[PDB]
Amino acid sequence: MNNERIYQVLKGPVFSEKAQVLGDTAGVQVFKVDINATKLEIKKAVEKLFGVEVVKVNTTITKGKTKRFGRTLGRRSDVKKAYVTLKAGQD
Amino acid sequence: MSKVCQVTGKRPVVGNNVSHANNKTKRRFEPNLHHHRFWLESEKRFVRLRLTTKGMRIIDKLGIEKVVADLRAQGQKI
Amino acid sequence: KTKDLREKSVEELKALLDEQQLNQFRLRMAKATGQLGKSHEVQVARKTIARIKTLLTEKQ
Amino acid sequence: AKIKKGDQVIVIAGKEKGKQGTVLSVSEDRVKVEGLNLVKKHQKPNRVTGAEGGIVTQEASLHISNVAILNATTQKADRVGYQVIDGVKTRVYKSTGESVAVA
Amino acid sequence: MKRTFQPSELKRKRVHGFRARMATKAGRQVLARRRAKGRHSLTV
RNA sequence: CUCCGGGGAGGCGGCAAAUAUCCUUUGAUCCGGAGAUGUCUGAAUGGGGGAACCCACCUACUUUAAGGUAGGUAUUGCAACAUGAAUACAUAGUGUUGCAAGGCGAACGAGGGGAAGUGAAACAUCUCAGUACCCUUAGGAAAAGAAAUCAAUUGAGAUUCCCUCAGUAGCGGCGAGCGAACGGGGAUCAGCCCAUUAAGUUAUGUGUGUUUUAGUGGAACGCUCUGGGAAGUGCGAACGUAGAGGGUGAUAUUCCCGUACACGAAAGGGCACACAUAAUGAUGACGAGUAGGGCGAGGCACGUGAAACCUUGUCUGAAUAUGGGGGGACCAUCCUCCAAGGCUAAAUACUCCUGACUGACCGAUAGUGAACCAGUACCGUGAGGGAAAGGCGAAAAGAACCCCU
RNA sequence: GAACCCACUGUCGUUGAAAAGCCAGGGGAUGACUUGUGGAUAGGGGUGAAAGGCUAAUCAAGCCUGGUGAUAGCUGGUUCU
RNA sequence: UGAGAAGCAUGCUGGAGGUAUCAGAAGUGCGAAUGCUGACGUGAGUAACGACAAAACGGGUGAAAAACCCGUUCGCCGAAAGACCAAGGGUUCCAGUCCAACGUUAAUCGGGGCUGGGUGAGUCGACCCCUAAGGCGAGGCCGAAAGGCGUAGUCGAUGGGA
Ligand SMILES: NCCC[C@H](N)CC(=O)N[C@@H]1[C@H](O)[C@@H](OC(N)=O)[C@@H](CO)O[C@H]1NC1=N[C@@H]2C(=O)NC[C@@H](O)[C@H]2N1
């Protein structure tokens, strides 16, 4: 695992009611990640770039929606989400 | 892998059947092909060739070694 | 910036690339959170990353 | 010929024929002149940004071939040519050959 | 009543698929004709 | 993204306006040339597979955990090397290395197979027609080509293409139909070799010449009337190696872009000629299972006919310069040529594509199926079939505000 | 005799709820039985306890594209003075 | 106005092209072909509104309520008209907002438009190991070419493996 891949594994945080409740209650972070990322990649990336220790990672993939503007159809890209559990109180 | 003579290159050709009322239908003429084993002294062994009776006449007139050398020079596994 | 970029050694260029990628990731995080009003920072970070890789290939 | 963002021009065709001013912008084959070719815009207010609407007056572009550069000394319309004075290209008036006044 | 089309994706891909067309000379000719005509989708 | 050249004030591709952050005379956007990067599928080539996916191995470096970087790992043919049975020498087999090939794409070329509808006022010989179609495989062209050829005053002189000869001579259930040659007039013109071996061709480098891929300069018009607007009316003027074309609020040589003409290249490409090195031509040295013959077919305008000549599936089979082939059954005399070994430009055929220009060609039911987000929507399991749909205004100046709802 | 597989009679429906059905009755229902998934056989061919039946709502020779603008002594049509 | 196919003048609309004379060339004249494409009639405000399990009232919102929401009664299924899985489909799932078109009526409602959310596995399934029918198939045998068959192998679940 190299630094170049490390800087591309993560994309951004998720802003939603479910993510907010999870963070405020169980100390779980929700991230948008690269579609080809693996759980070990996500763990090492979070541990290196946020200085917190990761207990376990859960991932899920949501297919993009197909919808119409005017007279043409289009599709959005798939999004992979990561539920990262931290130990005790961190971040 | 075909009805082709190794020595002369003969192969089936096409033609017509012609009846007494002059009706014409397609046919082919085939060569008088078959397998034959020839003793080769230079290599102490039998070589099996698929050839015609005209191929045997050529072999009888020229010798087996000359014919085998010609085929090898033409690029055949003999 | 390529003018002064070319005036550096291989080891300096590789390090420069390293903190440039780190900075690009940090700007991406900041913009995703909404703390970054200016995106030309991200654009120039991308651009200089490309420039450094080009110069490294040329110099090697 | 050429007409740039700073020159003083005179309108030679259209409803504004005979008037003069300073060009504001040049893009493709259309030019805007300060105080010339005004239009009335019925602007709806912008709910997001406030800015209650009204009727505003603004410039409208003319075709670039409808304006000519102005010769200050003679106060007449003139064409533009190019001359290599010393080692650099410069614009000159066709009628006199003198250098074109800067903005 | 039972109609003619009873869909099955595995059978569809094995009968009319890209590799099935590539496997024979006539299938390659079919793909060549469709490319020449300019179809947006070559196979099922 | 980088460098080199051009250019000189705007720019951040389009639908598609607004907006924001912005870049740029320390030279941006843009145009031309050369480089860097270039995920996955697909001949796809590490194995597999339902294309864009699943599973691997070996090296070198790197990590301390469960990985990362780069390289390699297909088959077949040829060559060298190594290894190696029945079987004693050997051969078969096996492996390593190096080289080459495969796939796609318009038409034209060459070769291997090859119909029927139809006409004959029915139909079988015949025709359609070696056409349609299938298969293999080249090149910028291919093929052919330097007489064992024609002619019949003893003359011409390799191949290819066009005009005549001529719908003639002939062939033909002598039906329907098929259909030459000799000679003459043109286009283009060229010959060179078989073991010490030629002309010619293909690569590489150099030299010279031309052409091409950005660009620069480039003349000359005013007044008046109508009009929303002048290029239009009326009156006078200027340039012309430039009165081609396009645009500008209606119809412009003199408003803009241009045109005639004159200049222009860091770097790269094509073509031409000349030198140097390769290599090819070039397993071949005057042509034997060959010419000729018997049987069955095919090709020649020529359907077995008085049927010469060419090719050969089958069976045979010479002479070899005091020799041999041809001159439309066959014989004699004359005339002419030398097969059974090769190479060779031009005149000829075609257009997926590129640049410029042209039309008594179309103008949205026309012209491509498609002027518009078209091989799309839609139909079909699939091969496949296959549409409709252009126009506000010169400029959005695209209707602030009030009223009914 | 239920499920399940069939299809003997009648009414209705026939521009249907349905390009072959509903309702009331009817037959087999441990067997030469019914059924899912995946395979094989291709057009003068296949398969058929045999009706010229079936082979994608198409069968005395499937569908698609080409020969092809097949041929028609037949029928229709053929535009101003 | 002329014997005719037709010609000429002018009012209104329209907003930029038209074209004498004499020659020249044709995609040169339509009512019919159960002709082709588009638009619009008559039937006619006629038939029908898709299982005869069935509805009634109070309140709410709303421009508008037989059909939406809440409540009180009535009725129907209950070896399926309930609860799951595979195949197949692909966002139809949840919340807010809108009612032109779609829904065989209206609709404030919706599987309709717009915006934003939502699918968390060492143990479930797939992937993976193993093979059936069958497919492909290094060499090989056969065939004018294209190709046919097949050995070693390699794939292939509807079956076996924590
Ligand atoms: N261009 C086409 C001409 C068609 C013919 N004319 C038709 C004809 O007459 N056929 C007859 C017919 O079939 C029958 O005799 C009868 N009359 O019934 C046989 C009995 O031998 O003889 C046939 N004749 C031939 N057979 C020979 C052959 O095939 N080759 C060579 C020569 O010998 C040919 N002539």
How far apart CA B62 and CA B51 sit, in angstroms, is 15
Q: Which residues contact D71 (CB under 8 A, 6 or more apart)?
A: D77, D78, D93, D95, D96
Q: Look up tokens 């590539």; give the residue.
A: E22
Spatial contact of B28 and B53, defined as CB atoms under 8 Å apart: no
DSSP for residue D87: T
Amino acid identity, position B71: L
Return the closest-CA partner of residue A13 out of A31, A36, A25, A37.
A31
Please list, in sequence order, all residues whose beta carbon lies within 8 angstroms of the beta carbon of residue D60, skipping any fewer than 6 positions away: D32, D37, D38, D39
d(CA A38, CA E10): 29
Q: Residue A11, by phi and psi: left (phi above 0), alpha (psi -120 to 50) or beta?
A: alpha
Q: How far apart are CA D75 and CA A20, in angstroms?
A: 73
Provide the positions of strand F that have an atom within 7 A of a protein CB. Answer: 1-3, 8-11, 21-23, 35-37, 42-43, 49-51, 66-69, 89, 91, 104-106, 112-115, 124-126, 135-136, 216-222, 228-231, 247-249, 252, 255-257, 283-284, 289, 296-298, 304, 312-317, 369, 373-377, 380-386, 395, 397-401
Give yes or no for A64 touching C (CB within 8 A): no
Q: How far is CA A35 from CA A1, A25, C16, C29, in A?
A: 17, 27, 28, 18
Residue ranges per structural domain of chain E: 1-44
B11, B51 contact by CB (below 8 A): no
**CA atoms of A59 and A30, how far apart (whole Å):** 10
The one-letter amino acid code at E32 reads: A
Name the residue ranges covered by the structural domains of chain B: 2-78
Q: Is A81 on the interface with C (CB under 8 A)?
A: no
Question: Residue A31 is inside which H or E element, if any?
Answer: strand A28-33
User: Which technique was used to obtain these atomic coordinates?
Assistant: cryo-EM
A64 touches A79 (CB < 8 A): yes
Flag whether B touches E (3+ CB pairs, 8 A cutoff).
no
Cα separation, B71 vs B77, in Å, equals 8
Rounded Cα–Cα distance for residues C36 and C42 (Å) = 10
A91, A46 Cβ separation under 8 angstroms: no
Is the separation of the CB atoms in A87 and A55 below 8 Å? Answer: yes
Please name the amino acid found at residue D31: V
